[PDB]
């Protein structure tokens, strides 16, 4: 299928603005990520995601840009159909490898948030840099198959696309199978992290509620003259301490309440004997011990939960804008070409497949680190 004919009134309006927006978003994303480089395991993966979009844009886009001079965009620019052989291989490579890069981002949050053991397990930050050659290596092996004899490339109707053609050869079905499985895999990791984050919010809420129970009842002991009110306030504090207590920080958190409950038992011991003033004296020492160990864990809990949920928002917007664009290609590949006499889903799948790589760097440009409004809305 070689569609040489093209209306003379073709203007390079859509191509130029798309290439400009893509390169500008990639450069802005690289410049803003370089500010952190002087940076986390999740951020270093975003650097390779915009780098893959920038590397692909510099190879895929300029091919159709220079060929806009003639009426026929690109029939055969170089012998042996080298023009499409370079265009089709580039779009096929930078589409599966880019989706594999999203899987590495989703798998990172899945291992870190989902499994506490994998977080304690050392994952070298420099190892994240080695992911990019591995992702390109796996994608290169799968994308090398259509380069053989059974692989076929035909020119689409606009004359600038020559992506994989549906035929008797079973490769377009396998290529969409990997993309479909990756979408489900990335969504499965996101759904797991969301469930883990929601469970993390309830644990922090219960921990904060027990923290308020300790502080509120502590003020009652200071103004409680009768020993009955002192024993009643210490009773709710002791139960709240056992509920809050339920890695180096984990061992210190348990030991923090183990000595804290003992101070409550000592204050309850003086309250039973009738020493109200001595019981209030132990209550003052209880505040110093609690702020030394327990308060430090609460501050880290609020900071860690806030930082990880921001990375999830960055991951959630990107996978949504990969899913809406990759679904037309999934339906197009699975459906037979002979089923539709005048196939129109093919051209639509080509558009979204290129748009998603352009939107991804702009997503990070809109979602700045001040996402506190999006975190709690």
């Amino acid at each position, epitope marked *: 299928e070689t569609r040489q004919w093209l209306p003379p009134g073709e203007s390079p309006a859509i191509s130029s603005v798309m290439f400009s927006a893509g390169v500008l978003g990639n450069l802005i994303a690289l410049a803003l990520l370089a500010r952190r480089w002087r940076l986390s395991l999740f951020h270093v993966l975003v650097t390779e995601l915009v780098f893959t979009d920038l590397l692909g844009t510099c190879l895929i886009s300029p091919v159709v840009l220079a060929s806009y001079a003639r009426n026929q965009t690109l029939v055969a620019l170089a012998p042996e159909s080298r023009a499409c052989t370079y265009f089709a291989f580039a779009m096929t490579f930078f589409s599966l490898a880019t989706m594999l890069m999203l899987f590495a981002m989703a798998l990172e949050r899945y291992l870190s948030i989902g499994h506490p053991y994998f977080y304690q397990r050392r994952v070298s930050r420099s190892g994240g840099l080695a992911v990019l050659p591995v992702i390109y290596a796996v994608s290169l092996l799968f994308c090398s198959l259509p380069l053989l004899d059974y692989g076929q490339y035909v020119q689409y109707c606009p004359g600038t696309w020559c992506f994989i053609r549906h035929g008797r050869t079973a490769y377009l079905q396998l290529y969409a199978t990997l993309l479909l499985l990756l979408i489900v895999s990335v969504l499965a990791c996101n759904f797991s992290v969301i469930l883990n984050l929601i469970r993390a919010r309830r644990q922090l809420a219960d921990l904060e509620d027990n923290w308020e129970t300790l502080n509120d009842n502590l003020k009652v002991i200071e103004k409680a003259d009768n020993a009955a009110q002192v024993k009643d306030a210490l*009773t709710k504090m*002791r*139960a*709240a*301490a056992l*509920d809050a207590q339920k890695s180096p920080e984990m061992k210190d958190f348990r030991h923090g309440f183990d000595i804290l*409950v*003992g101070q409550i*038992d000592d204050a309850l011991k003086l309250a*039973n004997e009738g020493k109200v003033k001595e019981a209030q004296a132990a209550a003052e020492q209880l505040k110093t011990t609690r702020n030394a160990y327990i308060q430090k864990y609460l501050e880290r809990a609020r900071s860690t939960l806030a930082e990880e949920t921001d990375h999830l928002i960055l991951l959630a917007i990107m996978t949504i804008t990969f899913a809406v664009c990759s679904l037309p290609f999934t339906i197009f590949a699975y459906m037979n070409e002979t089923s539709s006499r005048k196939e129109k889903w093919d051209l639509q799948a080509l558009r979204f497949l290129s748009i998603n790589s352009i939107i991804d760097p702009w997503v990070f440009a809109i979602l700045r680190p001040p996402v506190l409004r999006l975190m709690r809305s």
Partner: antibody, heavy 124, light 109 residues
Framework: EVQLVESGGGLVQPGGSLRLSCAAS????????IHWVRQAPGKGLEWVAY????????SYADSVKGRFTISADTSKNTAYLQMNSLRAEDTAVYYC?????????????????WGQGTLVTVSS | DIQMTQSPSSLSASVGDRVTITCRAS??????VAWYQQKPGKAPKLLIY???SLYSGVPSRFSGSRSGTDFTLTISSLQPEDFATYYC??????????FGQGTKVEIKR
């Protein structure tokens, strides 16, 4: 193994005094607090006394304050409870138990071993 | 002065049936709720401690669960050796120990 034997129960006239003894075997009383629970015939359980031989603190039920006196002897490794000015409602069964100190695993295992208990009947 | 209230007071079932007992605490207690089994003419025995773990020696048929301030004792399959009175106890403090009202399972016919 860990065993707790109670003794000293029986018939007591109202307004008198009785000395109950709880002997432990298999462990030391200085590492576990000793509790005395009472159960009335045709009713449930009711904690009536507690002592901690590690520090010497004692506690009783609000209904029995001022009439019971609990003590522990580490030389003999046992507990003695003296009951003065008994009433008609004291006809019950007394059980002896141990409770570990906080923190640790035996602390959450409250009353892991229960004694045989002895019967007390206060009737004139 | 927490007053433990046990709603199940009399339940009749046979072997193989599931039994559910509920214990209610007047005040919030984190995990200081234990279940004890007392046979007629015998000393009680601890079944479930901390409402999560199982005692070393008791059969695995008994299980414990927590929901808010309500504790649940679940027996999957009854046996002729499990027909005894059940008691709920709180052990939040050494001086704060209050038992429930009791629950004795019966054989239905």
């Amino acid at each position: 193994e860990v065993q707790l034997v109670e003794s000293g129960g029986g018939l007591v006239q109202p307004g008198g005094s009785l000395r109950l003894s709880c002997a432990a075997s298999g462990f030391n009383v200085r590492s576990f607090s000793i509790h005395w629970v009472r159960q009335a015939p045709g009713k449930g359980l009711e904690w009536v006394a507690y002592i901690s031989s590690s520090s010497g603190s004692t506690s009783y039920a609000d209904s029995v304050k001022g009439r019971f006196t609990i003590s522990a002897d580490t030389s003999k490794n046992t507990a003695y409870l003296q009951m003065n000015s008994l009433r008609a409602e004291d006809t019950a069964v007394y059980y002896c138990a141990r409770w570990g100190y906080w923190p640790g695993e035996p602390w959450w295992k409250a009353f892991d071993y229960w004694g045989q208990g002895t019967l007390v009947t206060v009737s004139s | 002065d927490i007053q433990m209230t046990q709603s199940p007071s009399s339940l009749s079932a046979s072997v193989g049936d599931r039994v559910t007992i509920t214990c209610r605490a007047s005040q919030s207690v984190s995990s200081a709720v234990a279940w004890y089994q007392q046979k007629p003419g015998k000393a009680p025995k601890l079944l479930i401690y901390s409402a999560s773990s199982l005692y070393s020696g008791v059969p695995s048929r008994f299980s414990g669960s927590r929901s808010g301030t309500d504790f649940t004792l679940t027996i999957s399959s009854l046996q002729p050796e499990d027909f005894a009175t059940y008691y709920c106890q709180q052990y939040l403090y050494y001086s704060l120990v209050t038992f429930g009202q009791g629950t004795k399972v019966e054989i239905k016919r």
